Amino acid sequence: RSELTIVPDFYPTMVRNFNPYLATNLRTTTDFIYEPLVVFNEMKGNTPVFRLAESYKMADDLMSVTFDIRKGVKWSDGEAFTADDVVYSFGLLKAKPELDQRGINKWVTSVEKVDEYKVRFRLSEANSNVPYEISLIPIVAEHVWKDVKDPTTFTNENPVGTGPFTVIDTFTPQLYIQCRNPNYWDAANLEVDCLRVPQIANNDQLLGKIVNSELDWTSSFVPDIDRTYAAANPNHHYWYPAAGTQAFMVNFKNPDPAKKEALDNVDFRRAFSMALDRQTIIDIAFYGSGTVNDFASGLGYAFEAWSDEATHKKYKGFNTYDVEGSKKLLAKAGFKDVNGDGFVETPSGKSFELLIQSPNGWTDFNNTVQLAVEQLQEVGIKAKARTPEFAVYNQAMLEGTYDVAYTNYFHGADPFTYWNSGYNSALQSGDGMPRFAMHYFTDKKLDGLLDSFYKTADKNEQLAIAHGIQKIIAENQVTIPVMSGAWMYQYNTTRFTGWWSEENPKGRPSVWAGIPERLLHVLDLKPVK
Numbered sequence: 234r235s236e237l238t239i240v241p242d243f244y245p246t247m248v249r250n251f252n253p254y255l256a257t258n259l260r261t262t263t264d265f266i267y268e269p270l271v272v273f274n275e276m277k278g279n280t281p282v283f284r285l286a287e288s289y290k291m292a293d294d295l296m297s298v299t300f301d302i303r304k305g306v307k308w309s310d311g312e313a314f315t316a317d318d319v320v321y322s323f324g325l326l327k328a329k330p331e332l333d334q335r336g337i338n339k340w341v342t343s344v345e346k347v348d349e350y351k352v353r354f355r356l357s358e359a360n361s362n363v364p365y366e367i368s369l370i371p372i373v374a375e376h377v378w379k380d381v382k383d384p385t386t387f388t389n390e391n392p393v394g395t396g397p398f399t400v401i402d403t404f405t406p407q408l409y410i411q412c413r414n415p416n417y418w419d420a421a422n423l424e425v426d427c428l429r430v431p432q433i434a435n436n437d438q439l440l441g442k443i444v445n446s447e448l449d450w451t452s453s454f455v456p457d458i459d460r461t462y463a464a465a466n467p468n469h470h471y472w473y474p475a476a477g478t479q480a481f482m483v484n485f486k487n488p489d490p491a492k493k494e495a496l497d498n499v500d501f502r503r504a505f506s507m508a509l510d511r512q513t514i515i516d517i518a519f520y521g522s523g524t525v526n527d528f529a530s531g532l533g534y535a536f537e538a539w540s541d542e543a544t545h546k547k548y549k550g551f552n553t554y555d556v557e558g559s560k561k562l563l564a565k566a567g568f569k570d571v572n573g574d575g576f577v578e579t580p581s582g583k584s585f586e587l588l589i590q591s592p593n594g595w596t597d598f599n600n601t602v603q604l605a606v607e608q609l610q611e612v613g614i615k616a617k618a619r620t621p622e623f624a625v626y627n628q629a630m631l632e633g634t635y636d637v638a639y640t641n642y643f644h645g646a647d648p649f650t651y652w653n654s655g656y657n658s659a660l661q662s663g664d665g666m667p668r669f670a671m672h673y674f675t676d677k678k679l680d681g682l683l684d685s686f687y688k689t690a691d692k693n694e695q696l697a698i699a700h701g702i703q704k705i706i707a708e709n710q711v712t713i714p715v716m717s718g719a720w721m722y723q724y725n726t727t728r729f730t731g732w733w734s735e736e737n738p739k740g741r742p743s744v745w746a747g748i749p750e751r752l753l754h755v756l757d758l759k760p761v762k
């Protein structure tokens with residue numbers, strides 16, 4: 234039996250939860266258990282790869298879109314996959330908005346069933362990118378979930394899915410094995426029988442295992458990769474294609490008076506920013522992987538084609554290592570040390586220590602925070618590294634109780650994914666939404682520009698919109714962008730072949746939940762002969 238050992242996420246222990254709509258589920262639920270209608274290859278310019286849906290047609294006015302369901306597709310329990318499943322799934326999100334992870338309810342007014350295998354989504358507002366948005370909403374089995382009294386707490390321990398791996402062959406606190414859907418519609422193209430998911434708590438435990446070659450597919454941070462991982466075995470391979478932005482997010486509505494006086498001050502944010510030595514952070518915390526990001530808007534040099542150089546040039550200085558500039562700005566801004574501790578107090582003389590957040594186990598981020606704390610001390614800003622578990626880290630943000638958090642973002646073929654997910658105030662409310670836009674800075678014009686991006690197909694018009702987004706975010710130094718990272722990815726050729734690589738760059742190679750292309754990738758693998 235071919236078993237592919239994968240690590241899409243860390244856990245202290247394995248807790249059986251296959252609910253695609255809950256943040257507490259196993260990260261092998263979406264894609265593998267519940268296959269999407271379509272999987273957009275974001276690397277290749279967001280090209281749709283059709284799976285459960287055969288095709289789709291967006292109306293010319295961009296106010297609706299139809300999807301043709303592929304006939305002959307079955308749930309793991311033999312029942313047919315039809316339009317009823319899609320209709321029910323979005324209806325569920327309307328019934329329980331906490332399960333709405335994309336904020337899709339705002340855009341989709343209704344989801345009508347044209348026929349057994351055809352559904353039509355009607356929008357509340359024009360969005361040519363709605364097909365992409367729809368593709369990220371998990372679709373569950375209506376014949377099963379209609380009998381579930383409370384979907385919000387349903388752990389779905391014995392899942393019925395459309396995906397390649399639905400059989401829970403083994404489940405212990407330290408390991409679970411997800412095997413082949415006995416009724417998979419694309420069975421002929423699946424050459425991997427089981428997904429082997431061992432319990433790994435953090436980057437330290439992962440390193441020990443990966444160098445010992447007991448893993449096949451991973452996307453973790455690995456220190457000194459060449460010496461410690463690559464040079465240790467000819468089957469140890471990796472590929473780090475460029476990815477999105479990484480930055481420190483500040484909470485504009487921190488409940489502490491002193492902290493809010495600091496964080497909700499653009500001069501302080503710029504001074505915080507100039508204190509950071511971005512290159513040293515990349516060299517030290519990331520071992521030279523990644524590039525400096527001195528775009529106040531967080532755009533990143535990779536997307537320079539979308540940048541208005543003038544805007545970049547004007548705020549670049551506030552996003553460049555400059556100790557003297559940082560201290561001079563703090564002083565000019567009225568931030569001074571009035572109690573002899575070497576740290577600046579707020580203008581009203583209040584003391585504060587910024588608790589910088591980064592998830593426990595994410596050593597590359599943890600090291601970045603500590604480096605940042607030390608760099609901030611140089612400019613007189615008092616801070617301390619905190620490493621709460623991801624759940625806590627994430628919660629403190631949805632609830633706005635954190636101070637500062639270092640984080641990465643998802644990355645698309647253009648800056649929209651980044652700007653929209655990291656700044657649209659619509660994504661700042663609602664349980665079930667990610668952390669990305671939880672800085673609590675809001676602007677009507679910004680939201681308008683963002684929401685207008687896909688209302689037009691005129692690239693020159695979209696560029697004009699992009700420029701408008703750039704200058705609002707840059708002007709307000711909403712976050713403290715630091716760098717553009719990469720899709721960390723490691724593969725072992727000991728047991729399987731067919732992996733994506735620089736030489737076979739089919740798309741984002743990551744195995745993390747949220748990278749739907751992982752379904753396509755796994756379907757390219759085959760055990761060694």
Ligand SMILES: CC(=O)N[C@@H]1[C@@H](O)[C@H](O[C@@H]2O[C@H](CO)[C@@H](O)[C@H](O)[C@H]2NC(C)=O)[C@@H](CO)O[C@H]1O
Pocket residue numbers: 240241242243436451452453454594595596597598641642643745746747
């Ligand atoms: C865009 C995003 O939020 N991606 C998340 C990933 O960062 C995260 O993976 C973890 O990222 C850390 C920071 O680079 C790594 O140190 C850590 O090793 C890595 N973990 C694994 C298992 O690869 C994943 C998983 O938590 O979630 C994504 O949402």
Ligand SMILES: [Mn+2]
Pocket residue numbers: 569570571572573574575576577578
């Ligand atoms: Mn002081």
